[PDB]
Amino acid sequence: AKKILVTCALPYANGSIHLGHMLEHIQADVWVRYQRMRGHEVNFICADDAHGTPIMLKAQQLGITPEQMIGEMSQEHQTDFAGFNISYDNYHSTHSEENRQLSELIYSRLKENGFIKNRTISQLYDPEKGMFLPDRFVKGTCPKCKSPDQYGDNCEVCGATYSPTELIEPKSVVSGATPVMRDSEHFFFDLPSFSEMLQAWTRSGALQEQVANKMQEWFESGLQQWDISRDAPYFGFEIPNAPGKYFYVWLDAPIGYMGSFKNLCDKRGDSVSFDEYWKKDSTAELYHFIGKDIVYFHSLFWPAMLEGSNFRKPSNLFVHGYVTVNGAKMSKSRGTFIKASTWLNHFDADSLRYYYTAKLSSRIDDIDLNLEDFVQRVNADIVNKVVNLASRNAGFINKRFDGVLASELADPQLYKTFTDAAEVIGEAWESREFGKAVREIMALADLANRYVDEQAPWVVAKQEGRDADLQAICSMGINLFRVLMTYLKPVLPKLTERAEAFLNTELTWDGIQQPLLGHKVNPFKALYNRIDMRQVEALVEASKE
Numbered sequence: 001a002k003k004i005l006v007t008c009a010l011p012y013a014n015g016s017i018h019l020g021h022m023l024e025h026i027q028a029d030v031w032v033r034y035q036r037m038r039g040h041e042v043n044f045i046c047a048d049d050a051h052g053t054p055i056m057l058k059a060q061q062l063g064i065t066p067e068q069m070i071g072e073m074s075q076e077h078q079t080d081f082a083g084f085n086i087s088y089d090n091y092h093s094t095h096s097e098e099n100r101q102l103s104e105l106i107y108s109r110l111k112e113n114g115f116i117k118n119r120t121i122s123q124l125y126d127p128e129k130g131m132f133l134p135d136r137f138v139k140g141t142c143p144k145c146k147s148p149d150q151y152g153d154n155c156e157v158c159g160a161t162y163s164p165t166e167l168i169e170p171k172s173v174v175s176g177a178t179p180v181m182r183d184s185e186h187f188f189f190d191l192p193s194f195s196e197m198l199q200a201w202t203r204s205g206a207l208q209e210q211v212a213n214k215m216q217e218w219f220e221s222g223l224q225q226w227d228i229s230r231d232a233p234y235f236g237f238e239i240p241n242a243p244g245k246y247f248y249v250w251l252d253a254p255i256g257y258m259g260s261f262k263n264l265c266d267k268r269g270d271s272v273s274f275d276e277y278w279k280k281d282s283t284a285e286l287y288h289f290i291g292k293d294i295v296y297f298h299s300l301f302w303p304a305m306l307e308g309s310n311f312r313k314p315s316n317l318f319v320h321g322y323v324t325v326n327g328a329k330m331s332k333s334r335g336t337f338i339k340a341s342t343w344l345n346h347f348d349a350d351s352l353r354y355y356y357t358a359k360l361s362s363r364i365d366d367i368d369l370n371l372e373d374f375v376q377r378v379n380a381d382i383v384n385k386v387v388n389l390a391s392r393n394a395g396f397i398n399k400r401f402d403g404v405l406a407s408e409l410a411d412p413q414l415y416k417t418f419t420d421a422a423e424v425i426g427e428a429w430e431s432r433e434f435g436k437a438v439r440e441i442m443a444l445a446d447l448a449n450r451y452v453d454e455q456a457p458w459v460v461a462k463q464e465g466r467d468a469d470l471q472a473i474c475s476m477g478i479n480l481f482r483v484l485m486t487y488l489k490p491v492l493p494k495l496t497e498r499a500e501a502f503l504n505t506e507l508t509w510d511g512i513q514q515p516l517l518g519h520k521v522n523p524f525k526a527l528y529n530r531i532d533m534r535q536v537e538a539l540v541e542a543s544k545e
């Protein structure tokens, strides 16, 4: 029994969960459910990333404490994830006592080990509001084309890039006052010291090929010290012995993974598991599912931080690409920037879980949600191939045989073909080659339906004295359905529950080796209905508004 700790990136507390987030949490949940099916001790961990200037300011605008705002967003996020049946063992927050103590601990260890440097820097400062301004909170006139109202380090008119200090007639986005350059002492983590350690980690062959390639680019560019401090006013953790200084959000965010697990352990009254999973000599496995935009933090800063603070490092990073809708980046104007909550008003969770899973692989390529294809694939695969196997046979069993399945498999060889595929399918789930697993499963589905077509139960049903053969044929189809639903259990939690209720049995990975013989099944109303483009149109229109 392996001990596995799996995480998804911590969603920022200043935005609603959208389809992009869902790709990641669904990918991880499918993997996690599969690992649980194989009997491993699994801990699926996540939490809201709740610190930062953006969050501080938004709360101030809304007129509420940052605590109240993040609390509300945390509830919103968890309701959405719950709606998609993401099976977390714990969903915490970076703004917690566990994270505060772990962040202070790791910082102190890094400092004690000589990995923290003090350095003075100059940054735009709002004298009115009395706060340093991150680039995005500085607006002015583009130095090049002279277009007004430009934000940050780039112009949205001529496309020029530059330091905010180059902006003409700068203005604070917060107060409108003119910002001025001001000095301030900052604390830096000496990432460069871990260069060789990180390079070895990169070439070990554990990380995805594409990720390793990206890392080589970063080593080539040269690692730099990392500014991990921010001045007050700020919403975050105060730095020990440094009044008015806070830990930059990205320093405490990943520590949030640890904080969330410590929280879970403490709530369980478990006093040994935290160290068993995080101590340097851990035999437990640690995996982070993340998007390509945050690979730098997880592959360079993070492993280094852990190493320097005497904690074990990630066993592996599982990176995925971006989500596109109809081939392009989500677009608000086109109504393709879809929120998780909105999606659930139109379709069930299983439909999206299946679609993403059918397109996912072990690579970091973008995943495209083509809405036209979505309708076609769900109806073709879920309704017509898998669920069909149950719906086309259950009726005869319930009405003609009192719900009792035959005492023997009509086609043992065919059944063995299905159970024999468990090894390859499980390996595909294990290796994250989801698309491959789905292709294999649907190939079996076609084989199952061909079997039923060949036996023509609709013909046998109307022929005198063929009762025995009818029960045999239909039971066979139902047993093939049993196996298919087992392979799909990690993917379709809800349909699986309905399938288990119909079958009167919990679906376990090894259970497929024992077909259901002389077994009572229950009647069932629509296990899964078809969807149509009208629903897709409604979703897009609702998203536009």
Ligand SMILES: CSCC[C@H](N)P(=O)(O)O
Pocket: 008, 009, 010, 011, 012, 049, 253, 254, 255, 256, 294
């Ligand atoms: C410790 S993972 C943190 C991830 C960021 N909050 P984001 O989802 O904004 O990239």
Ligand SMILES: [Zn+2]
Pocket: 142, 143, 144, 145, 146, 147, 155, 156, 157, 158, 159, 160
């Ligand atoms: Zn310009």
